[PDB]
Amino acid sequence: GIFANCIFCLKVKYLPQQQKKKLQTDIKENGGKFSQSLNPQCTHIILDNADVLSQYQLNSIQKNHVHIANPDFIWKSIREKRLLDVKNYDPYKPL
């Protein structure tokens, strides 16, 4: 699946529960893994709009080369049936 070898930390506390679960099932059904809390094994952290990261979290992210993405990264990669450019979906560095 398109998310093989990807490990996602989900910070999507403010999404409707239905959307959170669809995010999870979309990830799991397409080869992806989950990490409850942020750790060095994470390749990705998904952040909804209302969620923020601390300086400590941002430092860990930089150190461990974690990709910060919004839920659209998942939705649109699924929709296009192809892993998209995660750099186009970074809330902490919009383009």
Author numbering: 4 to 98
Quote the paper:
PARP4 is also referred to as vault PARP since it can localize to the vault particle, a cytoplasmic ribonucleoprotein complex. PARP4 has a distinct domain composition relative to other PARP enzymes; however, the N-terminal region of PARP4 is homologous to a collection of domains found in PARP1, a regulator of multiple nuclear processes including the cellular response to DNA damage. Collectively, the study establishes the human PARP4 BRCT as a nucleic acid–binding module.
However, the location of Phe39 on the potential nucleic acid–binding surface was intriguing so we also considered Phe39 as a possibly important residue. We mutated Phe39 to glutamine and to alanine to test the importance of this region. We determined X-ray structures of the four PARP4 BRCT domain mutants. As expected from thermal stability analysis, the overall BRCT fold was not affected by the different mutations, and superposition of the mutant structures with WT BRCT yielded RMSD values between 0.5 and 0.8 Å (comparing all 763–788 atoms). Mutants F39A and F39Q both led to a shift in the position of the sidechain of K23, which impacted the charge distribution at the structure surface beyond just the F39 location. Relative to WT BRCT (KD of 19 ± 4 μM), F39Q and F39A showed weakened binding with KD values of 35 ± 10 μM and 33 ± 2 μM, respectively. The TM of WT BRCT was measured as 51.6 °C ± 0.2 deg, whereas TM values of 54.7 °C ± 0.4 deg, 54.3 °C ± 1 deg, 58 °C ± 1 deg, and 60.0 °C ± 0.7 deg were obtained for BRCT mutants F39A, F39Q, K31Q, and K23/24Q, respectively.
